[PDB]
């Protein structure tokens, strides 16, 4: 399963770099995706909404940021 989730990981990171947000937002979302993909090591359709809501919590207040973040995780 390591190959599978690592493919997903690299894909979403590449998508993060291309996003129209400051490097701080990229930094936050990237570390969140790292944590989620390495706490797989450590309610079966809603994971796509759990992962999405965990990694994009970094936006918090601003709704704008939630937008681009979720868009990253849809594709």
């Amino acid at each position, epitope marked *: 399963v390591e190959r599978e989730l690592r493919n997903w*990981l690299s894909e979403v*990171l590449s998508k*993060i*770099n291309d996003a129209p947000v*400051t*490097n701080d937002i990229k*930094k936050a979302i990237s*570390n969140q995706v790292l944590k989620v993909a390495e706490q797989v090591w450590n309610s079966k359709e809603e994971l796509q909404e759990r992962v999405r809501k965990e990694v994009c919590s970094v936006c918090s207040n601003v709704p704008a940021c939630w937008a681009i973040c979720g868009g990253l995780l849809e594709v």
Partner: antibody, heavy 120, light 107 residues
Framework: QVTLRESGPALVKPTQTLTLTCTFS??????????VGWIRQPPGKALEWLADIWWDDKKHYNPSLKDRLTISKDTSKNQVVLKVTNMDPADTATYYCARDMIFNFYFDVWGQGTTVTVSS | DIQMTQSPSTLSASVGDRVTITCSAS?????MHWYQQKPGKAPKLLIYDTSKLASGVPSRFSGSGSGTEFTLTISSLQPDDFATYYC?????????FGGGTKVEIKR
């Protein structure tokens, strides 16, 4: 263990072109989120960021050296190459290459640095 | 752009004193990192993000701040803390360092 090492000439005559090669081990520029940047330091001056390269071949340069910087990455050989053109005598400096990550957005592991002197 | 002034530019303090260097930006910036550079050696990461010690840095080093004002502090100055400390920012291109702060030991 991450380790970078710069290489290049010790001397370039003014208006020549400087070719610096960062050779790294301990990580790869193909793996996601990775990056390598070039920071130089003139004698008795502060640090100055020049360029950086990412695993997705994205590139950024300091605007102060507009048009004179071209960075390139060769993941096969584990090398990055900065090429600075139209070398002035004020660009005499020690040039460092350092590693960067999209998680960090700061340089953690630096090379030892290579000193280049612009003179006749 | 995004540019930062450190103060003081230089400072002398006896061994054991609390010393604080202030890096102040020209824009709201997410984080502020700190590098320590010994003479004729490569810079070393001292404080990453804003308050996190890089590997090996002794507990005497603390970092703090937010928005447009940040500080690096040494609780008790050691003789081995002779260095030049540069603040660094990575939240907005181009990456910029502070002017620099030379820390000399009063003796």
């Amino acid at each position: 263990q991450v380790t970078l090492r710069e290489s290049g000439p010790a001397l370039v005559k003014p208006t020549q072109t400087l070719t610096l090669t960062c050779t790294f081990s301990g990580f790869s520029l193909s793996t996601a989120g990775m990056s390598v940047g070039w920071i130089r330091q003139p004698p008795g001056k502060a640090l100055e960021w020049l360029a950086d390269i990412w695993w997705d071949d994205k590139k950024h340069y300091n605007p102060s050296l507009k048009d004179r910087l071209t960075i390139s990455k060769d993941t096969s050989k584990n090398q990055v190459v900065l090429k600075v053109t139209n070398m002035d005598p004020a660009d005499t400096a020690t040039y460092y290459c350092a590693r960067d990550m999209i998680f960090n957005f700061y340089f953690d592991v630096w090379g030892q640095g290579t000193t280049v002197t612009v003179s006749s | 752009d995004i540019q930062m002034t450190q103060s003081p530019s230089t400072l002398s303090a006896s061994v054991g004193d609390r010393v604080t260097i202030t890096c102040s930006a020209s824009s709201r910036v997410g984080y502020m990192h700190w590098y320590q550079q010994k003479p004729g050696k490569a810079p070393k990461l001292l404080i990453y993000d804003t308050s996190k010690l890089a590997s090996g840095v002794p507990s005497r080093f603390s970092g703090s701040g937010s928005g447009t004002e940040f500080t690096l502090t040494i609780s008790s100055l050691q003789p081995d803390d002779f260095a030049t400390y540069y603040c660094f920012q990575g939240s907005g291109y181009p990456f910029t360092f502070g002017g620099g702060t030379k820390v000399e030991i009063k003796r």
